[PDB]
Short mmCIF file of C-alpha atoms and ligand atoms in Angstrom, two decimals:
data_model
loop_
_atom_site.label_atom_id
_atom_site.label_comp_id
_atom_site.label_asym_id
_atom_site.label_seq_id
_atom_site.Cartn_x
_atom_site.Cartn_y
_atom_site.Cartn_z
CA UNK A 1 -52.16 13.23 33.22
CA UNK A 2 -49.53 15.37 30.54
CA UNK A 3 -46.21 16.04 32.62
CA UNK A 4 -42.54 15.05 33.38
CA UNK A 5 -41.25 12.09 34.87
CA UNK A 6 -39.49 12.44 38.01
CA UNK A 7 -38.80 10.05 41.03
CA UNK A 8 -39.90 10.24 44.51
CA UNK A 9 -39.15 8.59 47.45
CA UNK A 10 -41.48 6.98 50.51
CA UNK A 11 -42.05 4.62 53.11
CA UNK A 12 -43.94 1.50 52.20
CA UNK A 13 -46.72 -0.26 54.65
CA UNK A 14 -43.61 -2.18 56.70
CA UNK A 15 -41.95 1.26 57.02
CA UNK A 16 -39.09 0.41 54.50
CA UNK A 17 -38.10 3.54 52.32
CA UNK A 18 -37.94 3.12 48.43
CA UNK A 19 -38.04 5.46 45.37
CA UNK A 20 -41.03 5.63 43.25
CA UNK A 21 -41.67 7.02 39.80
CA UNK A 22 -43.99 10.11 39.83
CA UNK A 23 -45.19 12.65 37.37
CA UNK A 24 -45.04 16.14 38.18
CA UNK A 25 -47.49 18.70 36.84
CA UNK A 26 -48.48 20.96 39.53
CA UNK A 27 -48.85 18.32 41.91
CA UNK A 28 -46.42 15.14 41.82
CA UNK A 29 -49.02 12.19 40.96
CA UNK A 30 -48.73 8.53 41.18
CA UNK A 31 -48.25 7.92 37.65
CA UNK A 32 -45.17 5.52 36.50
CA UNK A 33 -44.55 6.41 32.69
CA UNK A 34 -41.76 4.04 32.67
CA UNK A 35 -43.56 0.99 32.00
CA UNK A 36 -45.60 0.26 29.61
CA UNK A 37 -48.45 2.74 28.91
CA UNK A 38 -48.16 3.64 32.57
CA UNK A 39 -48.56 2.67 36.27
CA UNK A 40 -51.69 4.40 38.03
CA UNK A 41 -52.57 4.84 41.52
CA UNK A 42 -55.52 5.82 42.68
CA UNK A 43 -56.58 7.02 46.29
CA UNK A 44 -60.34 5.47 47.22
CA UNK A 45 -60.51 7.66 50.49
CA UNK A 46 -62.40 5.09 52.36
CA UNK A 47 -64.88 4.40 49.83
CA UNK A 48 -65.80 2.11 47.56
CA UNK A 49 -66.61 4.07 44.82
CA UNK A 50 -63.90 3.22 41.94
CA UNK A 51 -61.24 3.79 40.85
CA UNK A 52 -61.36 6.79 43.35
CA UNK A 53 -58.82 10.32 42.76
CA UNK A 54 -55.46 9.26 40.94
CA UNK A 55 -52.98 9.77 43.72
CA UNK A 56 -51.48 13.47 44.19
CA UNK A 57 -48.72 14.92 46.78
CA UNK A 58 -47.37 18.25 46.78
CA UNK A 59 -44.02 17.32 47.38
CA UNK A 60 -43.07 14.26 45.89
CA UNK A 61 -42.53 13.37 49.43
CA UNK A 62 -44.31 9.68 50.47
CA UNK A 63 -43.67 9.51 54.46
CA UNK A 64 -47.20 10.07 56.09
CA UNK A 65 -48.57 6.73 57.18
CA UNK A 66 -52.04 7.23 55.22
CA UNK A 67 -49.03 7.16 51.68
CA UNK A 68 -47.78 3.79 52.85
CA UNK A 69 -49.79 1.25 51.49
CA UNK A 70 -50.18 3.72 47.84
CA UNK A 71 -46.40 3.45 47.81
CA UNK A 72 -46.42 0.09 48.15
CA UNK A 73 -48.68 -0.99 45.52
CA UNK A 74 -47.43 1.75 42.97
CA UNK A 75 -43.97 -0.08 43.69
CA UNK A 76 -44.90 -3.46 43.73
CA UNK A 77 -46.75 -3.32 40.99
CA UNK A 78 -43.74 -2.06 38.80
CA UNK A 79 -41.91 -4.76 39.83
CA UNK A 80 -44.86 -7.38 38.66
CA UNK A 81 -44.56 -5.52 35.51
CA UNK A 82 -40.79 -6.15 35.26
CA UNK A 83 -40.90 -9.83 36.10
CA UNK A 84 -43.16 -10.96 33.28
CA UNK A 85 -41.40 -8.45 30.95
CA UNK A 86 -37.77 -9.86 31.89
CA UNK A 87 -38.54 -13.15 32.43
CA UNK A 88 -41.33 -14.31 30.29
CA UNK A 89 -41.15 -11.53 27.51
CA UNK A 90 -44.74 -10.38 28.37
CA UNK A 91 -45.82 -6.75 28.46
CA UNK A 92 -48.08 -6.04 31.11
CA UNK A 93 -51.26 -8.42 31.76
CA UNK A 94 -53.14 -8.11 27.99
CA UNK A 95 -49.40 -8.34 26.46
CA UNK A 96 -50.05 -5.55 24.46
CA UNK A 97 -48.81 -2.85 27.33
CA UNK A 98 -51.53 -2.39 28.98
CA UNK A 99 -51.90 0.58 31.98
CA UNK A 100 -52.20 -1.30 35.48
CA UNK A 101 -54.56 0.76 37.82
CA UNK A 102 -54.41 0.12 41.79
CA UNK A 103 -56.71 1.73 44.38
CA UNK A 104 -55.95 2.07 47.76
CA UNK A 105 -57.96 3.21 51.21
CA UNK A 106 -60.73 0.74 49.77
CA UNK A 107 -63.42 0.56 51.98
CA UNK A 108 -63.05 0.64 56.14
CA UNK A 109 -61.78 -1.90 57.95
CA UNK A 110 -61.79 -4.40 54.74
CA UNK A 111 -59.87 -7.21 54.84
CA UNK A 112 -59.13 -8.53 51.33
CA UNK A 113 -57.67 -7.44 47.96
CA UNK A 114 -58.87 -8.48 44.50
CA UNK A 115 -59.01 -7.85 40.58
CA UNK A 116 -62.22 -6.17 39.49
CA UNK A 117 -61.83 -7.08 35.90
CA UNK A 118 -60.58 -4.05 34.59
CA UNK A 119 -58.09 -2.70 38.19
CA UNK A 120 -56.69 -3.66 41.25
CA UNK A 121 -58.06 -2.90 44.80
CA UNK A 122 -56.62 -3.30 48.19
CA UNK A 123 -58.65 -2.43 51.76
CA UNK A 124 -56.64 -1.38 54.65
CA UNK A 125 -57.60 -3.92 56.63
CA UNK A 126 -58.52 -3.64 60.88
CA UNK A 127 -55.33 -4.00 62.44
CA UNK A 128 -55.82 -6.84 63.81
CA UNK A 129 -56.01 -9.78 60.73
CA UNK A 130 -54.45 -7.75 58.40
CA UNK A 131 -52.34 -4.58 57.91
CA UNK A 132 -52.85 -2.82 54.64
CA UNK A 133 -52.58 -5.13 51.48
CA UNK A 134 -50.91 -4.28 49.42
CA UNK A 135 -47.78 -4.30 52.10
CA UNK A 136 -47.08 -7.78 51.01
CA UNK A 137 -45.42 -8.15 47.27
CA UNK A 138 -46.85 -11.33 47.28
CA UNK A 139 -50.27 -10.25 47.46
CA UNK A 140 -49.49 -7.67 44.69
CA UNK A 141 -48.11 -10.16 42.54
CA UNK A 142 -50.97 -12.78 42.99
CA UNK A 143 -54.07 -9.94 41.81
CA UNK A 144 -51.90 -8.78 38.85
CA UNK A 145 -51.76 -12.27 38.03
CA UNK A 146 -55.41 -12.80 37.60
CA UNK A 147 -55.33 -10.35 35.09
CA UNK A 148 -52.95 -12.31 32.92
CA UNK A 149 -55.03 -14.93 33.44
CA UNK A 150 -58.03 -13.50 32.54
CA UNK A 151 -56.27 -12.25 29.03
CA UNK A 152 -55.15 -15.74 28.40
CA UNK A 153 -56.64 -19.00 29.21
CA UNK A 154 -59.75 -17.60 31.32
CA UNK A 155 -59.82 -20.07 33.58
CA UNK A 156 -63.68 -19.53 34.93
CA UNK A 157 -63.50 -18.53 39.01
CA UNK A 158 -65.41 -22.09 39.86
CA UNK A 159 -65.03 -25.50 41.15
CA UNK A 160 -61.44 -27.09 39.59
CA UNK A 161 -60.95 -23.99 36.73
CA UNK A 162 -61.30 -22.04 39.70
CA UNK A 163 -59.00 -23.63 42.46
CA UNK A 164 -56.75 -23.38 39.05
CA UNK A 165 -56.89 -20.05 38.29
CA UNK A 166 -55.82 -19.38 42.48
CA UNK A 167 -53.09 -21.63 42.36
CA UNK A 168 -51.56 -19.89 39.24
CA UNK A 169 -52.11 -16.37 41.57
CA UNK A 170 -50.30 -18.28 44.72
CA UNK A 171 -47.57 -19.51 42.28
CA UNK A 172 -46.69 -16.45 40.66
CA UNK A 173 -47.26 -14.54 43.40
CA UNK A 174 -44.49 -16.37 44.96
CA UNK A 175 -42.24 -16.63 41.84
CA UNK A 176 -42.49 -12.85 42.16
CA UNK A 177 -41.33 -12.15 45.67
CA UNK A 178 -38.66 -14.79 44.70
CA UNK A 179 -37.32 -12.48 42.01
CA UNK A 180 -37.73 -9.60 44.16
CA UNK A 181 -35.73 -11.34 46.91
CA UNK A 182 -38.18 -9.67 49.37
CA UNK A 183 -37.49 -12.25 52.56
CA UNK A 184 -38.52 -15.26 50.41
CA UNK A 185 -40.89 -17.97 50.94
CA UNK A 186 -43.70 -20.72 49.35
CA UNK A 187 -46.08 -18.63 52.35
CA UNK A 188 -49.03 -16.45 50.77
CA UNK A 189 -49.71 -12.75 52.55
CA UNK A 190 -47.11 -13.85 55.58
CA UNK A 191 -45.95 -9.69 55.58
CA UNK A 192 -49.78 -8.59 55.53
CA UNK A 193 -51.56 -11.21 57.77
CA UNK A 194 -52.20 -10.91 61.65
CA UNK A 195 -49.40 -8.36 62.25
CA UNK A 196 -49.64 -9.35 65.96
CA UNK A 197 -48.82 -12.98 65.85
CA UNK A 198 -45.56 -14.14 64.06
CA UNK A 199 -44.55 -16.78 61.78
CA UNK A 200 -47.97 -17.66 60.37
CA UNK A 201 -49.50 -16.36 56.85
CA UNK A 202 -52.81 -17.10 55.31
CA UNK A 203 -52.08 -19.94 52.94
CA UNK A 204 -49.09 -22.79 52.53
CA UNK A 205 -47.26 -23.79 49.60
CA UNK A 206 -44.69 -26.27 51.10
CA UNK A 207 -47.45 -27.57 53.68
CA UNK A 208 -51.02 -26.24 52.45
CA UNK A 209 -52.66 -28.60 55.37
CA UNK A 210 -50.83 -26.59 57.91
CA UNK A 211 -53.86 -24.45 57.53
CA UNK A 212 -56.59 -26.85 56.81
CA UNK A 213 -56.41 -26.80 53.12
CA UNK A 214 -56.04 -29.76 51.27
CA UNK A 215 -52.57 -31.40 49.97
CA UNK A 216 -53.60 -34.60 47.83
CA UNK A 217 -56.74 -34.76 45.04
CA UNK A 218 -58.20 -37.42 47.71
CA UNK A 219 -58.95 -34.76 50.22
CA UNK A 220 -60.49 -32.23 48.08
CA UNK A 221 -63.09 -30.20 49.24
CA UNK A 222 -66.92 -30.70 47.13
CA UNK A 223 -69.22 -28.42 48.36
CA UNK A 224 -70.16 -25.01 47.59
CA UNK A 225 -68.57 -22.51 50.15
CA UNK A 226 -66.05 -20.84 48.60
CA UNK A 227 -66.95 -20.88 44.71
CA UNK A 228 -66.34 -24.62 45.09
CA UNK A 229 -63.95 -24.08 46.96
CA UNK A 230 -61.64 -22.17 44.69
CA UNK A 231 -58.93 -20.89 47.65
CA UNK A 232 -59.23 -24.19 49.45
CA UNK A 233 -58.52 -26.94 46.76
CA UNK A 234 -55.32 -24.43 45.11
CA UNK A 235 -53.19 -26.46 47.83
CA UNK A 236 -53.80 -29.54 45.84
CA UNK A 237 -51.56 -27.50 43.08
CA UNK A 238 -49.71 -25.59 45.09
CA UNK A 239 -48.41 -28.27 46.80
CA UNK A 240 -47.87 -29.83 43.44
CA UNK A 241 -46.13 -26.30 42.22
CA UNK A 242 -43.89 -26.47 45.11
CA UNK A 243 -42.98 -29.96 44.86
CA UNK A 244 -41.86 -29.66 41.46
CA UNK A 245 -39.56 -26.55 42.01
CA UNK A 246 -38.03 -27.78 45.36
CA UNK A 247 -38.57 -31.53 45.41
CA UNK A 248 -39.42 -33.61 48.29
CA UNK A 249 -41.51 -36.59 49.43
CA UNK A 250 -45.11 -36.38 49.78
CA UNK A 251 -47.42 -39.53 50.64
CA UNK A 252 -44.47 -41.85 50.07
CA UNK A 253 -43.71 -40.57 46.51
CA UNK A 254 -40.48 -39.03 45.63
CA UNK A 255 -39.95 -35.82 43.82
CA UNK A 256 -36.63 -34.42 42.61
CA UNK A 257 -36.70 -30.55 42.07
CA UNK A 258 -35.88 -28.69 39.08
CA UNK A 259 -36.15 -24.99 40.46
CA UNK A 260 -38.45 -21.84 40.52
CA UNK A 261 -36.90 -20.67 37.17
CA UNK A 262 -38.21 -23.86 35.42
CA UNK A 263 -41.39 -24.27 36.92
CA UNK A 264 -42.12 -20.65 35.87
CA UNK A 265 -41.12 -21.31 32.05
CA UNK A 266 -43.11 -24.63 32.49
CA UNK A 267 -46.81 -23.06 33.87
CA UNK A 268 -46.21 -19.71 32.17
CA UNK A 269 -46.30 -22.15 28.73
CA UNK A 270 -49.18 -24.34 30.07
CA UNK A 271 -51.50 -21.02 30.99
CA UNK A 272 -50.81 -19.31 27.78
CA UNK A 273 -50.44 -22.29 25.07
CA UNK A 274 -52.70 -25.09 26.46
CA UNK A 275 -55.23 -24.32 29.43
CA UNK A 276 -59.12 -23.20 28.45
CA UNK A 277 -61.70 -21.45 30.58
CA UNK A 278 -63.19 -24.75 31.55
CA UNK A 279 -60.15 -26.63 32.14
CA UNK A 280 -60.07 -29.10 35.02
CA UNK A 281 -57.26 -30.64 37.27
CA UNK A 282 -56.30 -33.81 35.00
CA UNK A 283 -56.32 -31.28 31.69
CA UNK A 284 -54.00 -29.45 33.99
CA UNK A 285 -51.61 -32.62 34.65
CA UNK A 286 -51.61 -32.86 30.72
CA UNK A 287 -51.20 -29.56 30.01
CA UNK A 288 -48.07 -28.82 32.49
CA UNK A 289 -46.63 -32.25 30.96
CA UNK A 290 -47.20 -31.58 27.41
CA UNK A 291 -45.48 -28.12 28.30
CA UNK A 292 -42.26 -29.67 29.58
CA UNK A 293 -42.18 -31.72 27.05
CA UNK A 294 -42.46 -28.98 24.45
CA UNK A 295 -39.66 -27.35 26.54
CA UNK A 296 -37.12 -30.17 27.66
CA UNK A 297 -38.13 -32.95 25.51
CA UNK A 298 -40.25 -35.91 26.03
CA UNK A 299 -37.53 -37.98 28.58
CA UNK A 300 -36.34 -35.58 30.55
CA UNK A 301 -35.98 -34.99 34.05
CA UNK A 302 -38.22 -31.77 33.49
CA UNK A 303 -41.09 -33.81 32.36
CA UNK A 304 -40.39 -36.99 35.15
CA UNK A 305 -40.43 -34.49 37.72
CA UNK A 306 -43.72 -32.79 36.78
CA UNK A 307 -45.61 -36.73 36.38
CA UNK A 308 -44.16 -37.11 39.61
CA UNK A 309 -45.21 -33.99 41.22
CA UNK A 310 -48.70 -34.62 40.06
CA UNK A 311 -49.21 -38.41 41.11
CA UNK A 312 -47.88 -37.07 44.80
CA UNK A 313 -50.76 -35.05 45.09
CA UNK A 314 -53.27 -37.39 43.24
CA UNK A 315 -53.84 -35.77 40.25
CA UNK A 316 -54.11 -38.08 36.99
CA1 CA B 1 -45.83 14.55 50.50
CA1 CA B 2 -41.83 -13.32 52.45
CA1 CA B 3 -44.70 -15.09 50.71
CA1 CA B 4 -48.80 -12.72 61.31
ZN1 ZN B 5 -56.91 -14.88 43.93
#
């Protein structure tokens, strides 16, 4: 909608208070005209009918528990926006400025979040597995991300292209919260998931067979649950990801860490420059080394650490 830019302020899903940027024109709307060609969020009332009514309050005022989880991913997704802008020079998902559109109150009781192709969507959840989605930055961070994605290599959501494309998600989704310094961690929805029950989260970076999910190529999983198995074999890479920024020692191979900042410039390079829709784990390897190279030159550290990142978890 035509109006002025104004800020308002709120409680987010975890009861933490934070500004927002509204637009007032009768009614103060969820509408960020800061970034890019704007910042849209949409209330789905409980349906799923989308993208729903674009968020309105009469006082610019966010502190009734049914705003939380709007406030949050009206917020969180401005600070996706600002990561790949500040750090990676890219503007929004199509690079090209492109309006990011959220709806909340998806559904009853539903218990995910995802990308439709064209907006973002988060459910409530039931209290009990999850608390509303888009609570965790994280989570935010890792649907946004499929859009770039999408705009850029493609990767198809199947088999290895698919457990690809997730990984990327888990990685920058994590990269984000880094930057945000929300309570950092290589954890995926830890802020979100099973509100009751402490210390666990829904996927594992640092130890991705904590949870059952594989951490070496050997282990992968080769049915058809899943897509393939697209949110099960991402450890393989995650682990990998996670390795590479922190180091470690995983099946007996050694792995010396170069950091978050570097591993960002090094994947943000292989998804834009080298991977294709139907790329595959070893076209991965190749890509992330030929990306490094590119970067750091052919015998550095960068690229040792990424070859040995990748033969820890299998992957030639
Ligand atoms: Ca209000
Ligand atoms: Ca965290
Ligand atoms: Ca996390
Ligand atoms: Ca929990
Ligand atoms: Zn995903």
């Amino acid at each position: 909608i035509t109006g002025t830019s104004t800020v308002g302020v709120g409680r987010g899903v975890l009861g933490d208070q934070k500004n927002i940027n509204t637009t007032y024109s009768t009614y103060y709307y969820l509408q960020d005209n800061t970034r890019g060609n704007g910042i849209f969020t949409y209330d789905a009332k409980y349906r799923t009918t989308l993208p729903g009514s674009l968020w309105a309050d009469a006082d610019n005022q966010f502190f009734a528990s049914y705003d939380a989880p709007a406030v949050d991913a009206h917020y969180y997704a401005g600070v996706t926006y600002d990561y790949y802008k500040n750090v990676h020079n890219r503007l929004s998902y199509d690079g090209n400025n492109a309006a990011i559109r959220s709806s909340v109150h998806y559904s009853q009781g539903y218990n995910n979040a995802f990308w439709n192709g064209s907006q973002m969507v988060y459910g409530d959840g039931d209290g009990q597995t999850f608390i509303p989605l888009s609570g965790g930055i994280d989570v935010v961070a890792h649907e946004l991300t499929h859009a770039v994605t999408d705009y850029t290599a493609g990767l198809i959501y199947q088999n290895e292209s698919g457990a690809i494309n997730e990984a990327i998600s888990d990685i920058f989704g994590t990269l984000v919260e880094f930057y945000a310094n929300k309570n950092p961690d290589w954890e995926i929805g830890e802020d979100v998931y099973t509100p009751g029950i402490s210390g666990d989260s829904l996927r594992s970076m640092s130890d991705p067979a904590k949870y059952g999910d594989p951490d070496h190529y050997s282990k992968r999983y080769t049915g058809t649950q899943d897509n393939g198995g697209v949110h099960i074999n991402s450890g393989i890479i995650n682990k990998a990801a996670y390795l590479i920024s922190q180091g470690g020692t995983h099946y007996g191979v050694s792995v010396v860490g170069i950091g978050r900042d570097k591993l960002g410039k090094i994947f943000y390079r292989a998804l834009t420059q080298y991977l294709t829709p139907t790329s595959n784990f070893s076209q991965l390897r190749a890509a992330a080394v030929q990306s490094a190279t590119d970067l750091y030159g052919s015998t550095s550290q960068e690229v040792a650490s990424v070859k040995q990142a990748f033969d820890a978890v299998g992957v030639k």
